[PDB]
Every structure is written in structure tokens, then in C-alpha cells.
RNA sequence: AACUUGAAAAAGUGGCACCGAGUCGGUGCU
């Protein structure tokens, strides 16, 4: 029947899960193939796909080859050639000379009627295929998106989006004035730093401004790489050096990159179309004719200046290509000619203009120069659309195939090189290609049906205590810098350290200079905990508990008795200490001005628009990038017009929306205690998307992907919470989108509003909530013990590095009497000789001397493969003589929430305090499940000294507070995580790693091979076999 | 992953409801 799918996607980690029009996952019999007598079994339609990032087949299958570059280059060149020759089946010193660049023959055509040679045009047009430029701008280029102005405005709003504390405001620069003047790129840099008062160039911000001007700047001292990272936008090397640089640092900042080329482009746009005598005309290749111009006024100038002054050394600088001369620079770059005729011109008396052209850039250029690649594909669309508008009378072929030759040019299964040709690590795509076939064999599963929805959200990598004392970093040179603005010692009289500023009171204490934001005495250093934490925008409109809409008060009844932000009252009391706390940089602008709405009338509409659109927009491009693989992949059918039918629906999400329904409704998540988190995250995933779509359709452009009807916010807005809500077509007052889940609402006066117990949409009379049922329903879900978790078996390609082991029954020679004796062992096959091994298997293995080897069950087995033994425990097979642990402890969700609270335990009053009792309630849950750890592992584990030390520990360190006991049984479960083994530390007694060296009891085991979803299982028992 | 057809690019194979839940079990149907 009706379902859907959800996603959680990340490097190493591939969730998905299913449910039907009811909210339920639903469970299907299994065949099981295999030599076993089990052909059955019931599974559960959530799992989680793994795996471990390395060098492999598919790993060099994304990555990006000039191979492929060139192959689809002479593509493009074969479609542009047979339809010129077809029209054509139905001098070179002239050429030379009357078109000594590309570009002239560019700029003629565009703006000449007279009739040209038809290889000369089709020479042009050759080039406009083959070198067409980026598809970074969708859509016909406007000032919208080519003014350098608000695309710097963009960037800057990537920036501060990507980071969100310690931001930077750019309102009053003159982004156009500064980077489009005519100078020095490093004297561009200066002047924009300069006007930034909080950064430099060897920031972050500067050596962005540095790529995007064309300078080479470095990570290194950045982002705390051990490497250098050089990055040079002309380089045709910069696209996998971005990506090697997105793998040491993470992958979050593909759109701050992609932010600084779209600036880079809008520079070299704004250059471009500068020298625009005439309006239809091709300013690219203009004033590329005027730049060669230059070259050759220059060239001719510089020749005769050799000779007046001092005739020796001509030979040096226009014949020798000697050493660095500047026919070695037309021989081969400009730094180095540049330093080569810097003495010259220094030495040179009466320099003049040659010098400015020279420190500017524009001296002596090539044809095909630095930053000449960036150019959009939308200049060459309309230079061709120029062209043909004066060739049209001429030639009836061209007017026949304008559209044709213009989709040819336009137009981007391939999709390893669709995902190569992309901004990310070398992870990402792995587990996008994971992805994609996941969701394949989904929708095989369920009979070739296809689902309503498919729910999207790339899974936030854990901080890996590396960033944990980063942001502190930057927290205390923020307190630093506005506590020195200010004057107060406050730190001088209370000092604090790193790790202490993690305490979100403490901060905002810090933040609002030990003094109460709205009541003019000072806070308690000692009384912390009587005091509370308020939100300027309430949760019932905008769901945002980030530092920029915090504040710490002795009561929240002092904001006054209105449901919006705080009254006039304590503005006029506060406004000159709101001011300097902004002038001060502690305080951000965004966070002023939503503390100084009621001055300006309060919550508007337009806000309420803009909250929408910060709860429910991505603007992460790789999101959208495979949401269009997905959809493209899934939806292929059209109608008699030229629009698509979508019959599926892709839906996108952030990580805010699934973890503050989390949050909310007691649905915890703890990571490390088995895989099954990834399907849950799924799982919420497709609830959330399948809620929201059925309960708000008329906000498609919003989030969903695809060409809708783009709507407005006037329809979705009711004038009156009371007297207009639940009696008009306006579906929500409340901004916050989540709304409908709750039965409850608190709003910002303490009145707990209510809503029906059933949800349903308005217009089509769809009931979409119950709010009983669903919820205990996805409890069942999250408390459903059996989730699939495969982790996958890859090979090695590229102390030997063994491919993969070989599991191979063979005879040996034992004994003086070279009896043979039946054997059966675990052979590893390296790397060199893996060529020869599938060459001639039967011959490689006679070379190594085992006799009597069957051809028939000769078993390849890779890396991670999964043993099944006595009692369900399960083994990977790490390597030809190590085993890794296979199995996973599946902990009921009691526990699950019981473990997220009791670590959680000091991060509304009324419910902390509920919690705080019912953590404090539940003692035995410890034991608990301390009983249930030592029971898994003595039933898959097997480890009888790391068990028994582990007890003891437990025992010794029973009395210990029970948020140590729960973050310390959270270190525990390494014990029986999946994999490899790996040390842990109790409290104070550390056990170490129990190495399955021993690899002789798989010879005899229960070998299973686990497709990606895990669904489809083939179990193989191996003792049968000799 | 595994299985089958192919030199190769590449194509194909895993029934449906209910009651349940310790890594899935049981019942009806086919």
C-alpha cells in the first residue's frame, strides 16, 4: 500500500526506513538462500547500511580524471562536427594573420553581417562547445544573480550562516567599488580587509577574499592541518585539492568554497562587461581582442624601447628562451616572467604605463590565460544566440537546430562521474553511490512500487572533541575582546576557563557583562541555578535555541505579559546598555534587532515568512544535488507537454527538525550503544516529511524539490490567533512548523493552548495526526529490536596489503612420509599477486603447493565478512589471521532514554525537574543493564577476562554518581560495538583490546553474505564443506 | 555482497494479510 522512505545520509553511514499511511514500519518473511535448513525469516523494513572509507575499485571510480574531461570534451566536439558536416554533405597564412586570436573570429561573427567562411565559423562555434565554462548559475543571467554586490552579500551570508557565532556583519561595504577597481590583487585584498575591522587575510575570510581575487592562499594555519593545503582557482589541479582539503576538515564547507568562486565569478564578470562600448555586442571576447591589443601595442612598443636606452639584451628578452626571457614566458608562467623583468624595469629609466599594466594583471596576457575558465556558460548561450540571430538568413541548418544546438550545449547511467564532478571529501560520494543503490533495492523490495515520499537529511557528523575546544577558542576571545571594548574586570574579579564556557548559563551570564539584561542590579556569581533561561522569538514561533536567541534573567515575567518579543518598558530603561553590549561585538545584530521588534511594531509578517524559511529552506547545495539525483532517478515520466509528472516526491529536511522532535517528545537518541540510530533517524525522518507533506500542501517550493507554483505568505497567515484560527483557509498563525505534533502549546505568557486530538487537513479533509495512536506507534518502532546493520565487504586495490582472503580446501604434505592429509585454511592474497591469482587460480595455488584444490568452492572472501556461529554470535572476518566483532546489543528504548537522560542530566523547569526525578527514581536500570551487557557478551563476545575485569570494575565503582555510572557504561559499550576491537577506559581501570587472533573456528562457521539493505540474506554453511 | 547469462559495456532472482517480539517468532491465505 501507500509508504514512503527516509534518509539519513553521512561519510560513513547510509539509514533508511519505511512507513506506511499509519506511521508503521511495516515487517515482511525473507528468503533465505544458502546450503542451511532455515528458508525463512522475518525482518524488520528499517535498517543502516556502514562503511569504512578507504582505497577501492568504486573509490577511484569517483574520483575526477581528466580521462573522462577530455573524453566527453571530444564528445561535445564529434555532435558540433557531424552536424556541420551533415549541413555540409547536404589560407593558413591568412587566417594567421587577419585572426590572430580565437577571439577576434569570435568578436567578427558576433557583430559582422557580412558572409564568413563556413570552417572559420565552425571553428568558433568548435570552440564555444569545447570550452563553455561553469553551470554554477542555473537560469539565464540578471544583475540577480551577476552583480557583485549581493553576490559578495551571499557569501558573507554563507559565512555567517556556517558558523552563527562570532559572525561578520558586511552592510555599509562597498563590495562593487572595492574588488571591481582596476588594480593589484594583493592591494584589493588589503583594502577590502580593511574595511572588515575584525579579520585579516591569513584568517579564514581573508584568504577567501584572496581565492576569489585570484592570490594563492593557505589553510594550513586555518583549519590546524599537520599539511599544507595551497589552493590557486586558476590551477587546473584546484578541484581535487579542495576535495583532499574537505577531507582533512570536514565536508561542511562546500558552500563557503563554492560561495568564494561564485564571487571570484562575479569579479571576473564585472571585469569582463566593464569595457562594453556597445550594448549588442560580446563583451568576453571584446575585450579579449582589447587584451591582445594591448599585447601587441606593448610587444611593439617594448621592441622599439630595446635599442634607445641599451640595444644588448634584446636577444635576452624576445630570442634567447634562455633562462627566463619573455619568449621563455610565451615557451612557458607570469609570477616567474614577472620576477624576471622586474630588475629590468627597475634598471629601466622613465617607466611608465608597461608598469601598470604589469602589477595589475593585464601586461602581455595569452590567449587562454588565468581566470579565463570561470567565464559562465551563459555569456557563450548568448554569444551563440548572436550569432546565429546574424548567420539565420544564410543558412537554414542553424535556424532548423537553434534549440538543437542549444540543449547540446546546455544539457549535463553516469553516475559516478555525475557524483566525481561534485564538492565534498571522498567519502561523501561513496556513501551518496550508497545511497542511491539502497534506495533501489528498496523500491525492488516493495515490488517495483514507488513510494509517495522520500525524506532527505545528511547526518551531522559528532563533534570529535577536536572542534569541542575550538568553538571554546573562539567563545573566549569573543568575552575577551567585548570584556576590553567595555572596561569592567569581571574577569579579573571572577576568571573562567575554556571548558567552563561550554555551560550555556554561564555564558550568557558572560555574554550579558554580569549584569541583568532587563533589571538594572547585579547577578548572583554563586546563585546560578534560581535563575532562568528565555527566548527572545518564543518556540511557538521560530524553534531556535542557539546562542542568538538567548537570554538570562532573574524571571521571565519581567518580559512582560504579551505574547511578542519584550515590551517598550525595559527598552527605555535598557537601550543605552543594549547599545554598548552591540557596539561592544558581543552581541550580534541580528539578535539586537530581534531584541528591538517591539519598537519597530513588533512580530511582522514578513518575519513570519522568514522564519518559515529558516525553519524549512536548505541551503546546503550537495542536499540539493542528491535530492535531483533522486528524483531524476526516480520520477521519469512526462505527458503530452514538456513538464514533469510527479508521482514521487522528494522531501528535504534539516537535522534541527528530527533532533527538536527528539527533544520534545522523549524519542532519544544515543549513538554509540548500537547502529540501530541511523534507521531511527530515518525512521523520524519519513514520519516528520509524510506529516508535514500532508498537512501543508500548498508550501511545495518551500522545501520539496521540483518546479511548483511558487506561493506567498499573505494565504498561509491568519490575521487573528483566536478569532481568525480554525475559520478560515489560513493554515497556521504559529511560524514554528512543528505545531501539530504537539497537543500542548506553552506560549511566551504561560497560557498552554490546546489543540485537537486528531489532525487533519482543512481543504481535502485528510486526517494527518493522531496524536495517541502515531506516538505510541513510533514508540513501537524505536523500541523494535531487530534493525538491519551490514557493514560493507569492499576489496583492496593500490608489510604486504592483502586484496582479500581465500578460503580454499586443498591437500598437504605432512610428515617425512609426505602423507596427504585433508586441510582446510585461511590464505591471503596480496595486492601484486591478486593479477595472477584470477589469471590461473588452480596454477597460483599448485605454486604455493596445495594439491588437489577444487575449482568449485575456491570462496573469495573480502574484507568485514560476517561469521555467524554457535548461539548467534557473529565475527568479521578482519584479515587472513585477525576477526572482528559482528554482532549488536539491541537495548530497549526504557534503557535507550533512561542512558540519554542520566548522561544528559545537567544539559522548562517543570519538565527538567520531572526528568531530573525520574532519572533519580530508576536506580536499578544500572544494574539492569549491566546484566544485559554481561549476558550479550557471554553470548557473542566471549571474552571471559575482559568480562570479569569489567564486573569487577563495576562492582568496585558501584556507589559513584549515576551520571559517571551512565557516561561511563556509554564508554562500556565498546565492549560490544561492531567491528574492531579497541581499548576503553571504566573510571579508573582501563581493559585492553582482546585480538581474535585465533581465525580457525570460521573454517567451520555459518558465512553470510548481506546485500546493502541487509534484507536479502544468503547463509552458507561451511563445515559442510570438505 | 551472493547467484545466473555474456569477451566486454551491461542485463535479471527474493508472495500477501494478522497476532505478536531479544537480533524476530507465530497464524490465516497463496
Given at each position: 500500500?501507500?509508504?514512503?522512505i527516509?534518509?539519513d545520509?553521512?561519510?560513513?553511514?547510509?539509514g533508511?526506513?519505511?512507513?506506511?499511511?499509519?506511521?508503521?514500519?511495516?515487517s515482511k518473511?525473507?528468503k533465505?538462500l544458502?546450503?542451511?535448513?532455515?528458508h525463512?525469516?522475518?525482518?524488520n523494513?528499517?535498517?543502516?547500511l556502514?562503511f569504512?572509507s578507504?582505497?577501492?575499485?568504486?573509490?577511484?571510480?569517483?574520483k575526477?580524471?581528466?580521462r573522462?574531461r577530455?573524453?566527453?570534451?571530444?564528445?561535445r566536439?564529434?555532435?558540433?562536427?557531424?552536424?556541420?558536416?551533415?549541413e555540409?554533405?547536404?589560407?593558413?597564412?591568412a587566417?594567421?594573420?587577419?585572426y590572430?586570436?580565437?577571439?577576434?573570429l569570435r568578436?567578427?561573427?558576433?557583430?559582422?553581417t557580412?558572409?564568413?567562411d563556413?570552417?572559420?565559423?565552425?571553428?568558433?562555434?568548435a570552440?564555444?562547445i569545447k570550452?563553455?565554462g561553469?553551470?554554477?548559475?542555473?537560469?539565464?543571467?540578471?544583475?540577480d544573480?551577476?552583480d557583485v554586490?549581493?553576490?559578495?552579500?551571499?557569501?558573507?551570508?554563507?559565512?555567517?550562516?556556517?558558523?552563527?557565532?562570532?559572525?561578520?556583519?558586511?552592510?555599509?561595504?562597498?563590495?562593487?567599488?572595492?574588488l571591481?577597481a582596476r588594480l593589484?590583487?594583493?592591494?584589493?585584498?588589503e583594502?577590502?580587509?580593511?574595511?572588515?575591522?575584525?579579520?585579516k587575510?591569513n584568517g579564514?575570510?581573508?584568504?577567501?577574499?584572496?581565492?576569489?581575487?585570484?592570490?594563492?592562499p593557505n589553510?594550513?594555519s586555518?583549519?590546524?592541518?599537520?599539511?599544507?593545503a595551497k589552493?590557486?582557482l586558476?590551477?587546473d589541479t584546484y578541484?581535487?585539492?579542495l576535495?583532499?582539503?574537505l577531507?582533512?576538515?570536514?565536508?561542511?564547507?562546500?558552500?563557503?568554497?563554492?560561495?568564494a568562486?561564485?564571487?571570484?565569478?562575479?569579479?571576473?564578470?564585472?571585469?569582463?562587461?566593464?569595457?562594453?562600448?556597445?550594448?549588442?555586442?560580446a563583451?568576453?571576447?571584446?575585450?579579449?581582442?582589447?587584451r591582445?591589443?594591448?599585447?601587441?601595442?606593448?610587444?611593439?612598443?617594448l621592441?622599439?624601447?630595446?635599442r634607445?636606452?641599451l640595444?644588448?639584451?634584446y636577444?635576452?628578452?624576445?630570442?634567447?628562451?634562455?633562462?627566463?626571457?619573455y619568449?621563455?614566458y610565451?615557451?612557458?608562467?607570469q609570477?616567474?616572467?614577472?620576477?624576471?623583468?622586474?630588475p629590468?624595469?627597475?634598471?629601466?629609466?622613465?617607466?611608465?604605463?608597461?608598469?601598470?599594466?604589469?602589477?595589475?594583471?593585464?601586461?602581455?596576457?595569452?590567449?587562454?590565460?588565468?581566470?579565463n575558465?570561470?567565464?559562465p556558460?551563459?555569456?557563450?548561450?548568448?554569444?551563440?544566440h548572436?550569432?546565429?540571430?546574424?548567420?539565420?538568413?544564410?543558412?537554414?541548418?542553424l535556424?532548423?537546430?537553434?534549440?538543437?544546438?542549444?540543449?547540446?550545449?546546455?544539457f549535463?547511467?553516469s553516475?559516478?562521474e555525475?557524483i566525481?564532478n561534485?564538492?565534498?571529501?571522498?567519502?561523501?560520494?561513496?556513501?551518496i553511490?550508497?545511497?542511491?543503490?539502497?534506495?533501489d533495492?528498496?523500491v525492488?523490495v516493495?515490488g517495483?512500487?514507488?513510494p509517495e515520499?522520500?525524506?532527505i537529511?545528511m547526518?551531522?557528523?559528532?563533534?570529535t572533541?577536536?572542534k569541542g575546544?575550538?568553538?571554546?577558542?573562539?567563545?573566549?576571545?569573543?568575552?575577551?575582546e567585548?570584556?576590553?571594548?567595555?572596561?569592567?574586570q569581571?574577569l579579573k574579579?571572577?576568571?573562567?576557563?575554556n571548558?567552563?564556557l561550554?555551560?550555556?548559563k554561564?555564558?550568557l551570564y558572560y555574554?550579558?557583562?554580569?549584569?541583568?539584561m532587563?533589571?538594572?542590579?547585579?547577578?548572583?556569581?554563586?546563585?546560578?541555578?534560581?535563575?532562568?533561561?528565555?527566548?527572545?522569538?518564543?518556540?511557538?514561533?521560530?524553534k531556535?535555541?542557539?546562542?542568538?536567541?538567548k537570554?538570562?534573567?532573574?524571571?521571565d515575567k519581567?518580559?512582560?505579559?504579551?505574547?511578542?518579543?519584550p515590551?517598550?518598558?525595559?527598552v527605555?530603561?535598557?537601550?543605552?546598555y543594549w547599545?554598548?553590549?552591540?557596539?561592544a561585538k558581543?552581541?550580534?545584530?541580528?539578535?539586537?534587532?530581534?531584541?528591538?521588534?517591539?519598537e519597530?511594531?513588533?512580530?511582522?509578517?514578513?518575519?513570519?515568512?522568514?522564519f518559515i524559511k529558516?525553519?524549512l529552506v536548505?541551503?546546503?547545495?550537495?542536499?540539493?544535488?542528491?535530492a535531483?539525483?533522486?528524483?531524476?532517478?526516480?520520477?521519469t515520466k512526462?505527458?503530452?507537454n514538456?513538464?514533469?509528472?510527479?508521482?514521487?516526491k522528494?522531501?528535504?529536511?534539516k537535522?534541527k527538525?528530527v533532533?527538536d522532535?527528539?527533544?520534545?517528545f522523549?524519542f532519544?537518541?544515543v549513538?554509540?550503544?548500537?547502529?540501530?540510530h541511523?534507521?531511527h533517524?530515518?525512521?523520524?525522518?519519513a514520519?516528520?516529511?509524510?506529516?508535514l507533506?500532508?498537512?501543508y500542501?500548498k508550501?511545495?517550493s518551500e522545501?520539496?524539490?521540483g518546479?511548483?507554483?511558487?506561493?506567498?505568505?499573505?494565504?498561509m497567515?491568519?490575521?487573528?490567533?483566536?478569532e481568525?484560527?480554525?475559520a478560515?483557509?489560513?493554515?497556521?498563525?504559529?511560524s514554528?512548523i512543528?505545531?501539530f505534533?504537539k497537543t500542548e502549546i506553552?506560549?511566551?505568557?504561560?497560557e498552554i493552548?490546546?489543540?485537537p486530538?486528531?489532525e487533519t487537513?482543512?481543504e481535502?479533509?485528510?486526517?494527518?495526526?493522531?496524536?495517541?495512536?502515531?506516538?505510541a506507534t513510533?514508540r513501537?518502532?524505536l523500541?523494535?529490536?531487530?534493525?538491519?546493520?551490514?557493514?560493507?565487504?569492499?576489496v583492496?586495490?593500490?608489510?604486504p596489503?592483502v586484496?582479500?582472503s581465500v578460503?580454499?580446501?586443498?591437500k598437504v604434505?605432512?610428515?617425512?612420509?609426505?602423507?596427504?592429509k585433508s586441510?582446510?585454511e585461511?590464505?591471503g592474497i596480496?595486492?601484486?599477486?591478486?593479477?595472477?591469482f584470477?589469471?590461473?587460480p588452480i596454477?597460483?595455488?599448485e605454486a604455493?603447493?596445495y594439491?588437489?584444490?577444487?575449482?568449485?568452492?575456491?570462496?573469495?572472501?573480502?574484507k568485514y565478512?560476517?561469521?555467524?556461529?554457535?548461539n548467534?554470535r557473529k565475527?568479521?572476518?578482519?584479515?587472513?589471521?585477525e576477526?572482528?566483532?559482528?554482532n549488536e546489543?539491541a537495548?530497549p528504548?526504557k534503557?535507550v532514554?533512561?542512558?540519554?537522560?542520566?548522561?544528559?542530566?545537567?544539559?522548562?523547569?517543570?519538565d527538567?525537574?520531572?526528568k531530573?526525578?525520574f532519572?533519580?527514581?530508576?536506580?536499578?536500570?544500572?544494574?539492569?543493564?549491566?546484566e544485559?551487557?554481561?549476558?550479550?557478551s557471554?553470548?557473542?563476545?566471549?571474552?571471559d577476562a575482559?568480562?570479569?575485569?569489567?564486573?569487577?570494575?563495576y562492582?568496585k565503582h558501584?556507589d559513584?554518581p549515576?551520571r559517571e555510572?551512565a557516561?561511563?557504561?556509554?564508554?562500556?559499550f565498546?565492549l560490544?560495538?561492531?567491528g574492531?576491537?579497541?581499548a576503553?577506559?571504566?573510571?579508573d581501570?582501563?581493559?585492553?583490546?582482546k585480538?581474535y587472533?585465533?581465525t580457525?573456528?570460521?573454517?567451520?562457521?555459518?558465512?553470510?553474505?548481506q546485500s546493502?539493505?541487509?534484507l536479502?540474506?544468503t547463509?552458507?554453511?561451511?563445515?559442510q564443506?570438505?
Amino acid at each position: 500500500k501507500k509508504y514512503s522512505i527516509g534518509l539519513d545520509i553521512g561519510t560513513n553511514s547510509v539509514g533508511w526506513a519505511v512507513i506506511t499511511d499509519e506511521y508503521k514500519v511495516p515487517s515482511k518473511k525473507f528468503k533465505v538462500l544458502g546450503n542451511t535448513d532455515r528458508h525463512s525469516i522475518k525482518k524488520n523494513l528499517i535498517g543502516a547500511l556502514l562503511f569504512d572509507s578507504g582505497e577501492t575499485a568504486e573509490a577511484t571510480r569517483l574520483k575526477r580524471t581528466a580521462r573522462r574531461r577530455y573524453t566527453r570534451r571530444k564528445n561535445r566536439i564529434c555532435y558540433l562536427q557531424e552536424i556541420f558536416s551533415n549541413e555540409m554533405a547536404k589560407d593558413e597564412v591568412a587566417y594567421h594573420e587577419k585572426y590572430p586570436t580565437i577571439y577576434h573570429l569570435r568578436k567578427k561573427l558576433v557583430d559582422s553581417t557580412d558572409k564568413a567562411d563556413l570552417r572559420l565559423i565552425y571553428l568558433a562555434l568548435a570552440h564555444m562547445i569545447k570550452f563553455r565554462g561553469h553551470f554554477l548559475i542555473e537560469g539565464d543571467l540578471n544583475p540577480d544573480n551577476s552583480d557583485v554586490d549581493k553576490l559578495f552579500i551571499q557569501l558573507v551570508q554563507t559565512y555567517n550562516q556556517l558558523f552563527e557565532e562570532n559572525p561578520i556583519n558586511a552592510s555599509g561595504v562597498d563590495a562593487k567599488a572595492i574588488l571591481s577597481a582596476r588594480l593589484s590583487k594583493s592591494r584589493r585584498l588589503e583594502n577590502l580587509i580593511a574595511q572588515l575591522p575584525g579579520e585579516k587575510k591569513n584568517g579564514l575570510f581573508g584568504n577567501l577574499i584572496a581565492l576569489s581575487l585570484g592570490l594563492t592562499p593557505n589553510f594550513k594555519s586555518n583549519f590546524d592541518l599537520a599539511e599544507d593545503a595551497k589552493l590557486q582557482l586558476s590551477k587546473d589541479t584546484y578541484d581535487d585539492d579542495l576535495d583532499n582539503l574537505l577531507a582533512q576538515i570536514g565536508d561542511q564547507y562546500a558552500d563557503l568554497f563554492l560561495a568564494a568562486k561564485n564571487l571570484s565569478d562575479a569579479i571576473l564578470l564585472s571585469d569582463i562587461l566593464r569595457v562594453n562600448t556597445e550594448i549588442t555586442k560580446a563583451p568576453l571576447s571584446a575585450s579579449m581582442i582589447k587584451r591582445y591589443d594591448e599585447h601587441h601595442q606593448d610587444l611593439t612598443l617594448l621592441k622599439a624601447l630595446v635599442r634607445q636606452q641599451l640595444p644588448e639584451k634584446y636577444k635576452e628578452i624576445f630570442f634567447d628562451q634562455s633562462k627566463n626571457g619573455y619568449a621563455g614566458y610565451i615557451d612557458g608562467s607570469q609570477e616567474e616572467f614577472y620576477k624576471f623583468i622586474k630588475p629590468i624595469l627597475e634598471k629601466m629609466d622613465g617607466t611608465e604605463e608597461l608598469l601598470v599594466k604589469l602589477n595589475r594583471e593585464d601586461l602581455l596576457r595569452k590567449q587562454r590565460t588565468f581566470d579565463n575558465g570561470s567565464i559562465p556558460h551563459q555569456i557563450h548561450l548568448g554569444e551563440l544566440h548572436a550569432i546565429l540571430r546574424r548567420q539565420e538568413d544564410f543558412y537554414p541548418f542553424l535556424k532548423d537546430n537553434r534549440e538543437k544546438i542549444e540543449k547540446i550545449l546546455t544539457f549535463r547511467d553516469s553516475l559516478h562521474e555525475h557524483i566525481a564532478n561534485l564538492a565534498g571529501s571522498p567519502a561523501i560520494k561513496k556513501g551518496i553511490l550508497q545511497t542511491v543503490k539502497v534506495v533501489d533495492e528498496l523500491v525492488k523490495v516493495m515490488g517495483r512500487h514507488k513510494p509517495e515520499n522520500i525524506v532527505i537529511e545528511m547526518a551531522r557528523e559528532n563533534q570529535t572533541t577536536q572542534k569541542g575546544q575550538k568553538n571554546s577558542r573562539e567563545r573566549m576571545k569573543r568575552i575577551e575582546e567585548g570584556i576590553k571594548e567595555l572596561g569592567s574586570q569581571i574577569l579579573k574579579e571572577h576568571p573562567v576557563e575554556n571548558t567552563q564556557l561550554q555551560n550555556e548559563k554561564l555564558y550568557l551570564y558572560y555574554l550579558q557583562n554580569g549584569r541583568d539584561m532587563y533589571v538594572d542590579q547585579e547577578l548572583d556569581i554563586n546563585r546560578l541555578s534560581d535563575y532562568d533561561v528565555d527566548h527572545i522569538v518564543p518556540q511557538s514561533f521560530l524553534k531556535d535555541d542557539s546562542i542568538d536567541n538567548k537570554v538570562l534573567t532573574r524571571s521571565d515575567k519581567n518580559r512582560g505579559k504579551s505574547d511578542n518579543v519584550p515590551s517598550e518598558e525595559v527598552v527605555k530603561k535598557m537601550k543605552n546598555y543594549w547599545r554598548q553590549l552591540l557596539n561592544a561585538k558581543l552581541i550580534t545584530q541580528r539578535k539586537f534587532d530581534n531584541l528591538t521588534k517591539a519598537e519597530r511594531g513588533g512580530l511582522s509578517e514578513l518575519d513570519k515568512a522568514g522564519f518559515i524559511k529558516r525553519q524549512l529552506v536548505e541551503t546546503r547545495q550537495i542536499t540539493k544535488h542528491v535530492a535531483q539525483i533522486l528524483d531524476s532517478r526516480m520520477n521519469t515520466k512526462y505527458d503530452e507537454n514538456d513538464k514533469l509528472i510527479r508521482e514521487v516526491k522528494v522531501i528535504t529536511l534539516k537535522s534541527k527538525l528530527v533532533s527538536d522532535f527528539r527533544k520534545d517528545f522523549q524519542f532519544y537518541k544515543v549513538r554509540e550503544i548500537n547502529n540501530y540510530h541511523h534507521a531511527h533517524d530515518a525512521y523520524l525522518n519519513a514520519v516528520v516529511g509524510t506529516a508535514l507533506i500532508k498537512k501543508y500542501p500548498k508550501l511545495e517550493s518551500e522545501f520539496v524539490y521540483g518546479d511548483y507554483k511558487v506561493y506567498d505568505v499573505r494565504k498561509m497567515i491568519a490575521k487573528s490567533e483566536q478569532e481568525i484560527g480554525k475559520a478560515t483557509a489560513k493554515y497556521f498563525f504559529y511560524s514554528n512548523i512543528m505545531n501539530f505534533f504537539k497537543t500542548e502549546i506553552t506560549l511566551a505568557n504561560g497560557e498552554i493552548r490546546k489543540r485537537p486530538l486528531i489532525e487533519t487537513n482543512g481543504e481535502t479533509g485528510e486526517i494527518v495526526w493522531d496524536k495517541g495512536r502515531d506516538f505510541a506507534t513510533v514508540r513501537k518502532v524505536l523500541s523494535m529490536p531487530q534493525v538491519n546493520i551490514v557493514k560493507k565487504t569492499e576489496v583492496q586495490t593500490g608489510s604486504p596489503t592483502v586484496a582479500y582472503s581465500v578460503l580454499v580446501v586443498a591437500k598437504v604434505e605432512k610428515g617425512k612420509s609426505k602423507k596427504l592429509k585433508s586441510v582446510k585454511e585461511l590464505l591471503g592474497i596480496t595486492i601484486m599477486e591478486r593479477s595472477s591469482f584470477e589469471k590461473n587460480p588452480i596454477d597460483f595455488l599448485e605454486a604455493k603447493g596445495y594439491k588437489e584444490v577444487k575449482k568449485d568452492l575456491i570462496i573469495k572472501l573480502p574484507k568485514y565478512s560476517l561469521f555467524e556461529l554457535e548461539n548467534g554470535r557473529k565475527r568479521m572476518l578482519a584479515s587472513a589471521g585477525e576477526l572482528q566483532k559482528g554482532n549488536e546489543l539491541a537495548l530497549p528504548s526504557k534503557y535507550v532514554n533512561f542512558l540519554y537522560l542520566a548522561s544528559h542530566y545537567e544539559k522548562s523547569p517543570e519538565d527538567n525537574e520531572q526528568k531530573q526525578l525520574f532519572v533519580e527514581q530508576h536506580k536499578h536500570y544500572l544494574d539492569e543493564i549491566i546484566e544485559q551487557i554481561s549476558e550479550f557478551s557471554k553470548r557473542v563476545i566471549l571474552a571471559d577476562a575482559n568480562l570479569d575485569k569489567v564486573l569487577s570494575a563495576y562492582n568496585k565503582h558501584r556507589d559513584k554518581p549515576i551520571r559517571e555510572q551512565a557516561e561511563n557504561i556509554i564508554h562500556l559499550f565498546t565492549l560490544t560495538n561492531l567491528g574492531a576491537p579497541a581499548a576503553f577506559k571504566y573510571f579508573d581501570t582501563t581493559i585492553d583490546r582482546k585480538r581474535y587472533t585465533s581465525t580457525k573456528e570460521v573454517l567451520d562457521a555459518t558465512l553470510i553474505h548481506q546485500s546493502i539493505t541487509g534484507l536479502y540474506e544468503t547463509r552458507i554453511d561451511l563445515s559442510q564443506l570438505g
